Amino acid sequence: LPEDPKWEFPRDKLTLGKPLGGQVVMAEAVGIDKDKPKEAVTVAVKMLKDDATEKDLSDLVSEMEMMKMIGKHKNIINLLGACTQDGPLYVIVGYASKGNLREYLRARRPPGEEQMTFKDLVSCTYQLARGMEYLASQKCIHRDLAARNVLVTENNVMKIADFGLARDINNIDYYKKTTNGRLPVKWMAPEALFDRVYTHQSDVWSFGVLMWEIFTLGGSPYPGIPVEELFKLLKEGHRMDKPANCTNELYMMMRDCWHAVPSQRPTFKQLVEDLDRILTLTTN
Amino acid sequence: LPEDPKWEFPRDKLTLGKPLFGQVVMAEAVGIDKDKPKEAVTVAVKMLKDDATEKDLSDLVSEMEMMKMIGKHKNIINLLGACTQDGPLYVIVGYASKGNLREYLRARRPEEQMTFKDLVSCTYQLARGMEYLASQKCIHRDLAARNVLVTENNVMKIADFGLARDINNIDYYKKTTNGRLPVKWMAPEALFDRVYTHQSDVWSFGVLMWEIFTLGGSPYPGIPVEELFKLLKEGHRMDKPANCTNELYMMMRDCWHAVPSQRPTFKQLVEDLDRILTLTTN
Ligand SMILES: Nc1ncnc2c1ncn2[C@@H]1O[C@H](COP(=O)(O)OP(=O)(O)CP(=O)(O)O)[C@@H](O)[C@H]1O
Ligand SMILES: Nc1ncnc2c1ncn2[C@@H]1O[C@H](COP(=O)(O)OP(=O)(O)CP(=O)(O)O)[C@@H](O)[C@H]1O
Ligand SMILES: [Mg+2]
Ligand SMILES: [Mg+2]
Ligand SMILES: [Mg+2]
Ligand SMILES: [Mg+2]
């Protein structure tokens, strides 16, 4: 693959460590932060598994390239560098000490670890909306939004991650039977499968399920409902029930994200504004 | 999903158990053996994960359909039934108490040690299964120790038909063909030419042989997937395993012949392995 100095990082400056969670591992990167040339830094490294397929490699490359183009943002996991020459491809990204959001929330469920306050949940949701709002402004569709794909930092900052299925808005083959076949069904917008398209509004549908996972503290969507029976139920108007401790207002937000008609759903900008209000009013 | 009465099995007679294109769990099936209507049989059931994708569903469906087509053979995991109506798809297959071959072998490393004859016997059984598979015009495409199951009586059983296809159902020369086959068990032509024939499967059999004789070793140790095909193109081949005779290693090299038609057929492999096994036994 093409050499790209600006992002290349020395293999001898990286010490691979313990497994995290193809295959992702923790590691120390000496001087990865150019202003601290000798300072070792704890990072995360994504690389291929030993039994990886060709598609796994093209996916890893795609993920790296997408992260390069997206740019930097508070709520998006950051690319730190990559080892792409004379050796196995290593994609180095910022290390999130708290793990993924799904595991994070479940570990903080009431004893029935520090519990999540209603404000923490709204704040978590608001941060992600901002992240998605930015992504959309960069013409990027994630396509795989879910609690298991969000990382939490030491200071509880939410980071959208796993861009292994992400695409530039124009890099989607509309109407082909093979388009969107690798998207987890339970987080997927109906038009993704039915019409074989994908827009930012398809991402808002996913965001809706993410909201539900957040307010159920890491629950599994459509419990008891098999994936092969889901789209039938969705066509019939079925939608997940309101999470226990969730305001009717936040629930209507989820419901709005699940409008059958894409343009009928809120834009991420609208979600940010609404959530900003709710968060603020909760604070006061 | 079209109803196929012949294979349909009642859901109320199936009790899912502990965990083992999906996820496999142990289960108890009452009357799966039609001659013993009230008997509970321990089986294995493959189903979709909660986060399954559309492709995960079509693969499981394809897996089921491929197993129905293939027919029965002692060295191929057998289909017992399937719950396809009004509910999640369940593919019910025979339970293999010893797990997959790779785990089985790594456990028997110098937990009852494997003898040279056992290893050959193991290899011979798999060749027999592949010979039958090839005769049914089926290409497995994902042959490897991790895809071989071992029954209570140490019978080898080729499994995981999640990538298998009929020999004529291949999108020839398309750049997207064979994109989901583990690279280290994959025949060179499968990637360079985008084709897949029974001879591609024999190449994988070779790797499988190497895993067997190294007692579950990982192929091309120390070589990343990204670097393997250039090496393979240059002639690189894995070295002989210690607990392996030059003859058996030569069989591996034959399976890895660069030219597809120059690799032996499964029919020829079975004949040679039988001869070798017969000698090792007598
Ligand atoms: N930067 C990071 N810091 C901390 N943990 C990380 C991390 N990147 C990944 N992980 C951990 O590894 C898990 C899997 O990561 P990721 O979502 O990137 O998976 P993956 O693309 O390798 C496979 P899949 O698509 O099956 O998830 C995360 O849910 C998280 O627990
Ligand atoms: N019939 C059976 N009896 C016993 N164990 C079984 C079994 N079927 C599957 N298993 C166990 O589950 C493992 C995975 O099986 P299988 O190879 O079918 O996986 P899979 O198709 O679900 C996913 P992948 O393609 O990622 O392996 C096997 O290696 C074995 O340990
Ligand atoms: Mg992920
Ligand atoms: Mg991924
Ligand atoms: Mg398998
Ligand atoms: Mg499989």
Oligomer: homodimer
CATH homologous superfamily assignment of the largest domain in chain A: Transferase(Phosphotransferase) domain 1
The percent range for helix content of chain A is: 25-40%
Report how far the terminal alpha carbons of chain A are from each other: 53 Å
Main pleated sheet of chain A: 5 strands, antiparallel
The CATH topology of the largest domain in chain A is: Transferase(Phosphotransferase), domain 1
Secondary-structure arrangement, i.e. CATH architecture of the largest domain in chain A: Orthogonal Bundle
The total tally of domains of chain A equals: 2
Bound molecules: phosphomethylphosphonic acid adenylate ester, magnesium ion
Strand order of the largest sheet of chain A: 1-2-3-5-4
* Overall 3D form of chain A: globular
Query: Structural class, judged by helices and strands of chain A?
Result: alpha+beta
Order of helices and strands of chain A: EEEHEEHHEEEEHHHHH
What share of the residues of chain A does DSSP label as strand, in percent? Answer: 5-15%
Q: Name the biggest interface.
A: A-B, 28 and 29 residues
- Put simply, the count of helices of chain A is 8
Tell me, what is the CATH class of the largest domain in chain A? Mainly Alpha
